[PDB]
C-alpha cells in the first residue's frame, strides 16, 4: 500500500485572486494570457524554430542591436545574469561591479561563487556611478568585465549609460548592463552605447509571465566566450550549446535542453505588442506616467527617495517611508483594502522605502490614480 | 533615429499548428491550458505561497515521500539535475554515474564541469545496471553520490530500482535518481526505495508545459548539502536559498528569485489531475497502453529495441530502424502526412532507433492506433 495519499487541497479546483503595481511582475494583457493558454507544439519543430527566430528579431528590436548572438535564456533574471557571468568569466578574472543596491550585490555573490576577482564599487542606496568613479576602478583593478545596473529597481535610480561602453573599451574591458527593470520604459541602445552584454527579464515592462529572459552579446564578448580555455561551470547555461540551438552559429540545431514552449508563445506576443507600439512611444508613455505619479505622491505629502528627477527610474519609483509609520502596515493596508500590490525596500533599501511600479500596459495615469487613493487611505488609517 | 525597426514577422498575429507522441513534451489537457491562460498574482503573496504549499504536497504524493526538503526548480530537467549536483558535490568528491544513454552522459559533463571525481559505468544503448555492476563501482571508486536514470528515454529502458538505495547506504553513498521520463507512468517510491535525491520534469507524463521541475531531498542529502564548506557554484540554484523561499526551513520566506507564476498554476493543475486519478491507476493505464503498442508494432513487422519486456519503459518505446530505410524519412513522413510527432534516437542511440511516447492523458489505445497507421503508411511510401 502507498503511504502518501492524494492531497486534500489539490482535489479542490484552483482559483486565484484578482490583484499589481510593485517592482514586478506585472499584470498580463489579454493577448499574452491568450498565448499562455495555447496547445503545445513540437519543441524542435520547423514551427518552433520560426517562433524562436521571430523572438530573436524582437530582442534585436527592443535592445537596438544586430548582434547575431542574441537569444532567450530559459530562466529568470538571475538566470540570465549567471549565464553571462559563467560564460564570460574564467576563474580569477577581474570583475568590476556597481554595488549601489541589491542587483550589484547579487552580481557580487555570483562572481565570488564562480571564483572571479571581485571588486565592488560600493555606494549607498540612492547613489549612481559617474564616469570618473568608473575610470578610477578600471584603472586601479583593470577588470575584464564591468557590471552596471541600468534600472536599479531596489533604489528607484536610473543609471546614466552614454559613454561608459567606450570608457570600458579604452581599458580593454567588457560592459555588461542589467536592463531587466529599464528595458521598454526608458531609452536604451545596445550598439549605439557600446554595451557588450545586455540582458532583461520577460516580467517587467514587457508584461510577460516571469521565467524567461533576454540576452545579447557583442562580438568582443562572443570572442572572449568562444576562446575560453576552461569549460563554464554550468551545462544548462553553456553559451556554445545555446547559440547553436537558437540558430546563431553555422551548424544544424542540436538538442540541448527543452525550451519552455508556452512561455515562448507569451514572450513572442509581448514582443509583438511593443514592436507594434514602438519603443519611443513606450518610453514616452512611461516618462509621462512617472511624472504624473511623482506629482500626486508629493501631493499626499510624501518625499521621493531620489531627489534629482533626471536620476529617477520611470518604471519603479522609490518613496521615503513617512516618519512615524510602519512600512509593513501601509503595504498591508493597500493590498488588504484595495486589492493592490506595492512593495517595501529590498537589500540595502530594506525598510527605508516604498516601491511603486509602472510597467508596460500597466503604466497608466489611471493606475497612478488608483494607487494614489490607496496610499491616501493607508496614511489616514495605518497607526502613527 | 533608431536603426533597428519593428520586425515585419512580429506584426502578424501568432498562430501555431495542431500536432505529440514522441519522448516529450506531451500535449496539454484543457485544464492545464486553462491554468496557463490565467492572470498574474503577487509572486510573494499569501495566495502564491498557498499554491506553492499545495504543489509541495503534490510532489510528496507523486514521489511517495514525506521529505520536508521538497520543492520546485524554476527550470527544465537539466536544471533540476545541475541543481542536485551543484548543491551535493564539493569539487573532487567521488561521483558514480550510470552511463547507459544520453542522460548519464549529461550527468557526466555536468559532474566534470563542477570539478567532481567522475567515474562513468559505461554501457551500450539498451543496457541497464545490476546490483553487482553497482557494488563493483561502489567498491572500486567509493563515491559520495551515485546517479541512475530510471526511465531511460534515449534507449527505452526501465531501470530496476529496488534495493540499490540500501546498496548505496552500506557504502555510505547517496542515491540520485532521474525520473523525468518515468514519474507517473511506472512504479516509483522514493522513501520505500531509499532514494536520496529524486527529480522529475513537468513536461512528460504530468502533461504540463516544459520549464519546471520537481525535486526532493532525504535528510542524509539535506545534511550533506547544509554542512558543505564551499559555497555551490550557482546562486540561482543554491538550495539553502530555495528551501527558505519554498517554506521548507524555519525562517520567514526571503526573496531569492522570481518563480514562474503562470507555470506554477499549470504545474499545480497537472498534479491535481494525477492526484485525482491516483498513481496506481496511472501506472496501470501506462502499462496496458505500452503492451497494446508493442503488439501493434510487431504486427507492422518491426523489431522492438529492448528485447526483454520487463526492461521496457512504458512511457517511451524504442523500435529498431527497419533495415533499408532512412529513419529521417520515416519521422518526416509521419509528421508531414499525419500531423504526428515521433522522434529518432538521441546520444548513443542516434540513428539506431525510433522513439514513441505515451505520456499522461496522451497514453491511450486510441493514440497508439493513430501512430500505428501513420507508421504503416511511412513503411509503404518512404524509399527503400
Ligand atoms: C525584477 C528585476 C530583477 C529580478 O529578476 P528575477 O526574475 O527575480 O530573477 C533583477 N534586476 C532588476 C533590475 C529587476 O528589475
Ligand atoms: C525529457 C527527459 C529529460 C530532458 O529534460 P529537459 O527538459 O530537456 O531539461 C531528461 N531525462 C529524462 C529521463 C527525460 O525523459
mmCIF file of N, CA and C and ligand atoms in Angstrom, chain A residues 236 255-258, chain B residues 23 76-79 103 149 151-153 178-181 199 203-204 210, ligand 2:
data_model
loop_
_atom_site.group_PDB
_atom_site.id
_atom_site.type_symbol
_atom_site.label_atom_id
_atom_site.label_comp_id
_atom_site.label_asym_id
_atom_site.label_seq_id
_atom_site.Cartn_x
_atom_site.Cartn_y
_atom_site.Cartn_z
ATOM 1 N N UNK A 236 23.597 23.630 -18.516
ATOM 2 C CA UNK A 236 22.358 24.322 -18.799
ATOM 3 C C UNK A 236 22.613 25.689 -19.441
ATOM 4 N N UNK A 255 19.899 19.326 -30.182
ATOM 5 C CA UNK A 255 19.171 19.354 -28.888
ATOM 6 C C UNK A 255 20.070 19.610 -27.696
ATOM 7 N N UNK A 256 19.665 20.509 -26.821
ATOM 8 C CA UNK A 256 20.461 20.823 -25.661
ATOM 9 C C UNK A 256 19.636 20.607 -24.412
ATOM 10 N N UNK A 257 18.722 21.542 -24.184
ATOM 11 C CA UNK A 257 17.652 21.359 -23.238
ATOM 12 C C UNK A 257 16.352 21.717 -23.956
ATOM 13 N N UNK A 258 15.244 21.474 -23.257
ATOM 14 C CA UNK A 258 13.900 21.703 -23.766
ATOM 15 C C UNK A 258 13.448 23.103 -23.385
ATOM 16 N N UNK B 23 9.090 11.189 -27.209
ATOM 17 C CA UNK B 23 9.601 11.192 -25.834
ATOM 18 C C UNK B 23 9.218 12.415 -24.993
ATOM 19 N N UNK B 76 14.184 23.552 -16.489
ATOM 20 C CA UNK B 76 13.913 22.257 -17.068
ATOM 21 C C UNK B 76 14.593 21.078 -16.343
ATOM 22 N N UNK B 77 14.446 19.878 -16.905
ATOM 23 C CA UNK B 77 15.107 18.679 -16.372
ATOM 24 C C UNK B 77 16.600 18.812 -16.071
ATOM 25 N N UNK B 78 17.368 19.294 -17.045
ATOM 26 C CA UNK B 78 18.797 19.572 -16.823
ATOM 27 C C UNK B 78 19.021 20.537 -15.672
ATOM 28 N N UNK B 79 18.056 21.408 -15.441
ATOM 29 C CA UNK B 79 18.223 22.421 -14.421
ATOM 30 C C UNK B 79 18.151 21.728 -13.063
ATOM 31 N N UNK B 103 21.445 10.380 -20.824
ATOM 32 C CA UNK B 103 21.144 11.009 -19.526
ATOM 33 C C UNK B 103 22.202 10.777 -18.425
ATOM 34 N N UNK B 149 19.621 6.689 -14.072
ATOM 35 C CA UNK B 149 18.443 7.010 -14.889
ATOM 36 C C UNK B 149 17.371 5.955 -14.684
ATOM 37 N N UNK B 151 13.828 6.008 -15.949
ATOM 38 C CA UNK B 151 13.264 5.834 -17.280
ATOM 39 C C UNK B 151 14.252 6.382 -18.286
ATOM 40 N N UNK B 152 15.007 5.495 -18.935
ATOM 41 C CA UNK B 152 15.984 5.974 -19.898
ATOM 42 C C UNK B 152 15.300 6.227 -21.248
ATOM 43 N N UNK B 153 14.795 7.441 -21.426
ATOM 44 C CA UNK B 153 14.069 7.802 -22.645
ATOM 45 C C UNK B 153 14.882 7.748 -23.950
ATOM 46 N N UNK B 178 17.056 9.961 -11.640
ATOM 47 C CA UNK B 178 16.370 10.750 -12.681
ATOM 48 C C UNK B 178 15.078 10.070 -13.128
ATOM 49 N N UNK B 179 13.948 10.636 -12.709
ATOM 50 C CA UNK B 179 12.654 10.046 -13.030
ATOM 51 C C UNK B 179 11.838 10.975 -13.914
ATOM 52 N N UNK B 180 12.489 11.720 -14.791
ATOM 53 C CA UNK B 180 11.761 12.674 -15.594
ATOM 54 C C UNK B 180 10.803 11.865 -16.478
ATOM 55 N N UNK B 181 11.351 10.879 -17.187
ATOM 56 C CA UNK B 181 10.559 10.018 -18.063
ATOM 57 C C UNK B 181 9.570 9.153 -17.297
ATOM 58 N N UNK B 199 14.492 13.490 -8.828
ATOM 59 C CA UNK B 199 13.945 14.609 -9.587
ATOM 60 C C UNK B 199 13.140 14.159 -10.830
ATOM 61 N N UNK B 203 7.092 18.180 -18.014
ATOM 62 C CA UNK B 203 6.564 18.004 -19.348
ATOM 63 C C UNK B 203 6.259 16.588 -19.817
ATOM 64 N N UNK B 204 6.635 15.561 -19.049
ATOM 65 C CA UNK B 204 6.429 14.175 -19.520
ATOM 66 C C UNK B 204 5.057 13.730 -19.121
ATOM 67 N N UNK B 210 6.773 22.380 -20.535
ATOM 68 C CA UNK B 210 8.163 22.323 -20.120
ATOM 69 C C UNK B 210 8.616 23.618 -19.508
HETATM 70 C C1 LIG C 2 12.718 14.564 -21.218
HETATM 71 C C2 LIG C 2 13.802 13.979 -20.340
HETATM 72 C C3 LIG C 2 14.984 14.813 -19.987
HETATM 73 C C4 LIG C 2 15.140 16.231 -20.542
HETATM 74 O O1 LIG C 2 14.711 17.312 -19.719
HETATM 75 P P1 LIG C 2 14.880 18.794 -20.330
HETATM 76 O O2 LIG C 2 13.518 19.383 -20.131
HETATM 77 O O3 LIG C 2 15.272 18.503 -21.747
HETATM 78 O O4 LIG C 2 15.902 19.544 -19.500
HETATM 79 C C5 LIG C 2 15.991 14.240 -19.193
HETATM 80 N N1 LIG C 2 15.932 12.983 -18.706
HETATM 81 C C6 LIG C 2 14.896 12.148 -18.951
HETATM 82 C C7 LIG C 2 14.875 10.757 -18.384
HETATM 83 C C8 LIG C 2 13.766 12.605 -19.788
HETATM 84 O O5 LIG C 2 12.731 11.769 -20.029
#
